[PDB]
């Protein structure tokens, strides 16, 4: 398998761009940045709103839990490479505690509203708008030879007053090299592509497009998360019970992939459930034929079939957002 677009980005660029292990970090001054309050946590970091004491400007301070050199350089190099791109979080500085060597990444501040309370208040137009801005970020990172590999609402910071969006946490991100076999233990469960769940390692940017489809289905149908699996086997089961097993079987044979016998047993046999079956009274003002056509074009087993970010941005679903932006 290879990506249908941007396959050659890292091939044409100098080795320094993608050879992240050759990076030598340029540490800033820890004392420039003070923690104001904790705003988040995860497996790999704690996150705080802070202040730059020099200019009194707000920032985000991401304090990293103990991390391998190879891995931190990967996140830093990716951040540096993408800094300035549309709707990409801006890494401002990198600093470390002198005693413990605990590193902190310093970002532009974004005045985020919790997706769990934000999303239910979004208008149909709002959803179109924010999904479009998120697509800008993904087309950009893909065009620069990077897969994000952890698209989910938790990684999309939305300042809803300034109508602004940032794709954050490039901790799981990777350079795309044609034919490279990648680790499948990426993304977060509810957003993992079938490729991950069936051990197809030679995946590409299209992975992010499945995750985006899952986020989108969550929004229009008001079903958070959309595919609610308990473990990675059950995740494939949940998907199979919507998309049906025939399409799964065609996918598997195309890539010459066999399911673990135990997984095959769990998946069983299932017919396709039309998207309209998820419509109900709560969500109804959100679920037009344009919404559905677009969602259907994202949520495909076959990664090679899904819309590219560039394509998605042109889908008629977003025609009002483009018209407004053109002005
Ligand atoms: Br970077 C970054 C930014 Br910007 C924001 Br705002 C938040 C929040 Br709010 N939680 N975690 C965050 C991370 Br990581």
UniProtKB/Swiss-Prot annotation:
Pfam families, per the entry: Pkinase (PF00069)
Domain of life: Eukaryota
GO annotation, cellular component aspect: cytosol; nucleus; protein kinase CK2 complex
Active site: 150
EC number: 2.7.11.1
Catalyzed reactions: L-seryl-[protein] + ATP = O-phospho-L-seryl-[protein] + ADP + H(+); L-threonyl-[protein] + ATP = O-phospho-L-threonyl-[protein] + ADP + H(+)
Molecular function (Gene Ontology), one example: protein serine/threonine kinase activity
InterPro entries associated with the record: CK2_alpha (IPR045216), Kinase-like_dom_sf (IPR011009), Prot_kinase_dom (IPR000719), Protein_kinase_ATP_BS (IPR017441), Ser/Thr_kinase_AS (IPR008271)
Protein kinase domain span: 33-318
GO biological process, one term: DNA damage response
Chain positions recorded as ATP binding sites: 39-47, 62
Keywords for this protein: ATP-binding, Kinase, Nucleotide-binding, Serine/threonine-protein kinase, Transferase
Assembly information from the UniProt record: Tetramer of two alpha and two beta chains (possible).
Free-text function comment from the UniProt entry: Casein kinases are operationally defined by their preferential utilization of acidic proteins such as caseins as substrates. The alpha chain contains the catalytic site.
Record family assignment: Belongs to the protein kinase superfamily. Ser/Thr protein kinase family. CK2 subfamily.
The protein's name in its UniProt record: Casein kinase II subunit alpha
């Amino acid at each position: 398998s290879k990506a249908r677009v941007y396959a050659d980005v890292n091939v044409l660029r100098p080795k320094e761009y993608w050879d992240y292990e050759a990076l030598t970090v340029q540490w800033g001054e820890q004392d420039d940045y003070e923690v104001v309050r904790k705003v988040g946590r995860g497996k790999y970091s704690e996150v705080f709103e802070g202040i730059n004491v020099n200019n009194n400007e707000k920032c985000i301070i991401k304090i990293l839990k103990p991390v391998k050199k190879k891995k931190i350089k990967r996140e830093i190099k990716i951040l540096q490479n993408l800094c300035g791109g549309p709707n990409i979080v801006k890494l401002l500085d990198i600093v470390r505690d002198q005693h413990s060597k605990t590193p902190s990444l310093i970002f532009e501040y974004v005045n985020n509203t919790d997706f769990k309370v934000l999303y239910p208040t979004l208008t149909d137009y709002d959803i179109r708008y924010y999904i479009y801005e998120l697509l800008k970020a993904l087309d950009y990172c893909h065009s620069q030879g990077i897969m994000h590999r952890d698209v989910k609402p938790h990684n999309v910071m939305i300042d809803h007053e300034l109508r602004k969006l940032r794709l954050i946490d490039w901790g799981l991100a990777e350079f795309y090299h044609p034919g490279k076999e990648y680790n499948v233990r990426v993304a977060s469960r509810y957003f993992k592509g079938p490729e991950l769940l069936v051990d197809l390692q030679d995946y590409d940017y299209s992975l992010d497009m499945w995750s985006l489809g899952c986020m989108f289905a969550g929004m229009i149908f008001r079903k958070e998360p959309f595919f609610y699996g308990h473990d990675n086997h059950d995740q494939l089961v949940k998907i199979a019970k919507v998309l049906g097993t025939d399409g799964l079987n065609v996918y598997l044979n195309k890539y010459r992939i066999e399911l673990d016998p135990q997984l095959e047993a769990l998946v069983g046999r299932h017919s396709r459930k039309p998207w309209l079956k998820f419509m109900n009274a709560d969500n109804q003002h959100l679920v037009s034929p344009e919404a559905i056509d677009f969602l259907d074009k994202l949520l495909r087993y076959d990664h090679q079939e899904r819309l590219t970010a560039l394509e998605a941005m042109t889908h008629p679903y977003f025609q009002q957002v483009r018209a407004a932006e053109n002005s």
